[PDB]
Ligand binder design. Sequence first.
Ligand SMILES: NC(=O)c1ccc[n+]([C@@H]2O[C@H](COP(=O)([O-])OP(=O)(O)OC[C@H]3O[C@@H](n4cnc5c(N)ncnc54)[C@H](O)[C@@H]3O)[C@@H](O)[C@H]2O)c1
Ligand SMILES: NC(=O)c1ccc[n+]([C@@H]2O[C@H](COP(=O)([O-])OP(=O)(O)OC[C@H]3O[C@@H](n4cnc5c(N)ncnc54)[C@H](O)[C@@H]3O)[C@@H](O)[C@H]2O)c1
Ligand SMILES: NC(=O)c1ccc[n+]([C@@H]2O[C@H](COP(=O)([O-])OP(=O)(O)OC[C@H]3O[C@@H](n4cnc5c(N)ncnc54)[C@H](O)[C@@H]3O)[C@@H](O)[C@H]2O)c1
Lengths: 337, 339, 339
Amino acid sequence: KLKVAINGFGRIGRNFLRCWHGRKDSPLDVVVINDTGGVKQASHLLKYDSILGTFDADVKTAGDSAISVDGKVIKVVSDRNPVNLPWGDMGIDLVIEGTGVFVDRDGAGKHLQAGAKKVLITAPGKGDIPTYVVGVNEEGYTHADTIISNASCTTNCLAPFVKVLDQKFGIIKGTMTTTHSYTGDQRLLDASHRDLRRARAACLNIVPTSTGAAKAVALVLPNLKGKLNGIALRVPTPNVSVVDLVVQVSKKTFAEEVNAAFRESADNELKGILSVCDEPLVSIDFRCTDVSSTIDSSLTMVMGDDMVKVIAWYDNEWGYSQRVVDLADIVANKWQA
Amino acid sequence: KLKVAINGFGRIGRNFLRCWHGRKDSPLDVVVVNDSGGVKSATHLLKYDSILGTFKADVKIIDNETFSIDGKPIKVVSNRDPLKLPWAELGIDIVIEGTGVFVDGPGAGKHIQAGAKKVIITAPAKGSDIPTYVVGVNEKDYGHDVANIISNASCTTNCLAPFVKVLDEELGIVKGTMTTTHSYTGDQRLLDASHRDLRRARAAALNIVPTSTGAAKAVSLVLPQLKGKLNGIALRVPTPNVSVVDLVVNIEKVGVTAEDVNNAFRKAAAGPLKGVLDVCDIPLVSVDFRCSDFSSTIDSSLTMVMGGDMVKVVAWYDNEWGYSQRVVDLADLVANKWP
Amino acid sequence: KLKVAINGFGRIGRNFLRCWHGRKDSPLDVVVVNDSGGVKSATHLLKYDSILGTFKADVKIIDNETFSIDGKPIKVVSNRDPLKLPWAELGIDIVIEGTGVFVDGPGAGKHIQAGAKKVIITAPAKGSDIPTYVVGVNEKDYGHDVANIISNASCTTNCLAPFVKVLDEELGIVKGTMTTTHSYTGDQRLLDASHRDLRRARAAALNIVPTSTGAAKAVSLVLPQLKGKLNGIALRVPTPNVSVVDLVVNIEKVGVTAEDVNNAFRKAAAGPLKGVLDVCDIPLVSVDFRCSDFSSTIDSSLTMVMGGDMVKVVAWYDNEWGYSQRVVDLADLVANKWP
Ligand SMILES: NC(=O)c1ccc[n+]([C@@H]2O[C@H](COP(=O)([O-])OP(=O)(O)OC[C@H]3O[C@@H](n4cnc5c(N)ncnc54)[C@H](O)[C@@H]3O)[C@@H](O)[C@H]2O)c1
Ligand SMILES: NC(=O)c1ccc[n+]([C@@H]2O[C@H](COP(=O)([O-])OP(=O)(O)OC[C@H]3O[C@@H](n4cnc5c(N)ncnc54)[C@H](O)[C@@H]3O)[C@@H](O)[C@H]2O)c1
Ligand SMILES: NC(=O)c1ccc[n+]([C@@H]2O[C@H](COP(=O)([O-])OP(=O)(O)OC[C@H]3O[C@@H](n4cnc5c(N)ncnc54)[C@H](O)[C@@H]3O)[C@@H](O)[C@H]2O)c1
């Protein structure tokens, strides 16, 4: 019922499209794809993925400006400047901004100009923009918002179970460190970058880089403003990452009580978002996981009764996409104009 | 004695500067770099390198555009358009074009227009106007007045040529194919993303990636006699540096044995190619060739003749260091043959 | 449609401009000339020519740097160093390098650095980097993206090649020698004076002057099959323009007769070479070929086979006009094969 446009057919662009194809009766409907790459490029990479593996569906290069997916046809355009994209001409109701450049009022806006109605930024918003984390405050949304960000891959993980903690033990303060797979942003070989760390090898190092997810939590959980903050470590893995939260709560608590709380929420309210896992697994064992966050129960540990540490896995690509879709899935509902 | 500029401060360019520093007493003298990132981004990466390791020497940031390697200053500018470069102002004699963009006559020449005397491309020329040299093979063929734009060939071609010569020049190469298990490179995607070559667009780090390569044909450019007889592909494998070539040319001569083919190398190795070729009999692996000054190293124990006529060789070469070292020899030449 | 510059306003360059003017509707458009002499010296010589005769059209001096041929302006600059040229400013698409100095890659390319898109040398290239074309023979071999610097060969080579082809391509050329009684040229001394070639240093006007010429070898550059089979000298004789070639190649084929050899030309003349080759049966003399649009004309009555295998031909070609006319065809090509 809701016409969608994917701008920035990159990792989240494709991880999304596919995430979508798997949903049943989706209020969303992709019709146009805009990426610096030609129809060839869009086809190939939607079909052959080095992380999600070959796509189970018939994907051919139907057209000079389109591609086919199980028959459903989609147009592929390519303008490095949004304003030009025929969003208005095609009656684009929603745009999934996954390019990594248009993250600000000014930028994301060029989509509105092109005739688009709304712009969902597949990343944290820069400046004054509505940030929502499905499961943490999607009710805050209102069809009034023309530009929203679905936060970061990290925040979307850390948030859900932080809510659970604070909302039960009261987070006083706490740091966190996310051992994260690398991303398109890193340099494959020591090359220039504005982050001399991210500028390094990427596949040969543990690259400490900074993350906003720290303060971004507060963005969606107003209560924790200035109580959280952490860094991140980019390790040699193409996907799936883990967060190492460490909060100090008021209400003295113990190991299994914490985990318990998590499960409870994971079975009720956060069912579909959060989840626990006792089976001692590892990174790779968490590919294609529809949930945003997954607690590694056996790792959770408490100190002096009030210092809680929680490890949590999450597929920074898929799981996020599934959220992106779930958000857009929402915009389609509670949509009046 | 001769002022040198380095256009493109990445791997090969930085590998250059390093090569040059710790040297006998090169007539060369790097006085300027063109890294689109400032003294910061250009310094840091010269000091800390993931593949060569922390550079051994005081590298400080003087001025806002003038770092220094042990006191010796190096002015650093930045601009994508060579035309705006101060080559003339500074009086640049040689320019090491290591960007992989300016590889045609019109392009690389933009440096001359800026005020450069001579230009060396650290890659194969796209023109036909430009001479391709390969120290050890046909370096003599270079003499002042003869073209002010030369190409030090390819990393692969500069590893092949040398021992390809000794093969034909002392056994006669009928013709043959070749492959090269090559360490991934900057032109590859880190993760599956758009790229003009749907092979290079795949995670450089998690795939064996087949990609065309002229390095084979170009051998001729230095060894005419072979023109249109060699050829092959290349395979990118998750290894940041150091690669190997797999040459399979069925010889013309008799039907010699294995270990004698070797001896030819061994002979031509400590002789005319002392510094270029070499043969390592001890069974090692890629990582053992990091920082190898030899343009090519044959794995003795790997060589093997099949049907008397078909010979098969395998050579080891550090694509970053090795090439860069030759590029300093080829720039070392220019200066030794200068008025 | 396409903006053209002319670097070097002498004989060939001026012969160019003239050729171009009175033309169908060339896509070319001369907008600037580089004659180290100003509008005066550049105008006068375009209007009054001792070998072509007063130019038929209103040529006036507008501005202090902008004469006009029938209203159409032509900006004129002057500087020995192409680098200082306003090629970019004006947006020059093609440059007719007719000075005889910039004939190597580095040189002729200086025009690209100034802002030129493509450069055509009106002479043989000294490099090896540059393609040599000869309309009528291998012009197809030229396509955009393929080198931005080409050479329209030599006046002699552009007269030979054409009919040399028809010879081999329909009779098989074993190999042969050749001579060329050539009208003296600017590179010769007027009176016995210092000159790097003690032959050219002799009174161009009062001596038959023997001087080497590659024009013979260079035939190969366009006709590979002959590579290293032709060759010859040249003789300068007191005649300001229009020359003749004396080819003597003993054929491979049977032992055909005279008048049939001719017929081949005659055939290939009104056929594939309609505009390049031609055969004149009427006994004339040099002066009758002034302003001849044909790159080569064979003197029917002069051809003669000797021992069945040895064929001898004589061709007529206006070295100034003819060549210049091809140079406008070769520049006409560039434009017809442009994005
Ligand atoms: N993968 C993750 O872990 C993850 C998850 C959450 C957030 N993010 C953020 O989302 C953003 C999207 O990046 P990605 O993960 O999709 O990887 P990516 O870098 O491959 O995606 C960017 C894509 O957009 C295209 N593009 C860039 N500018 C464009 C323009 N003007 N018009 C059209 N196409 C254009 C690029 O060619 C590329 O294909 C990044 O900033 C990333 O940090 C990433
Ligand atoms: N070290 C190696 O792996 C290796 C091996 C042999 C040869 N080469 C060749 O060397 C060339 C350089 O590539 P690289 O591998 O060093 O990659 P790189 O990206 O590390 O180096 C490129 C450098 O050139 C600069 N640059 C790019 N475009 C520029 C422009 N328009 N103006 C000015 N500077 C510009 C970049 O900022 C960077 O500093 C390539 O052609 C490559 O094939 C590299
Ligand atoms: N018309 C002919 O007789 C003829 C025949 C075929 C080809 N060519 C070739 O054409 C070339 C031109 O010589 P030409 O015979 O026309 O003699 P020319 O002296 O009449 O022409 C040379 C022109 O180039 C200019 N020039 C010289 N050096 C220059 C420099 N550094 N920068 C800018 N302009 C410069 C001169 O001022 C002059 O206008 C020669 O290589 C010649 O072999 C001439």
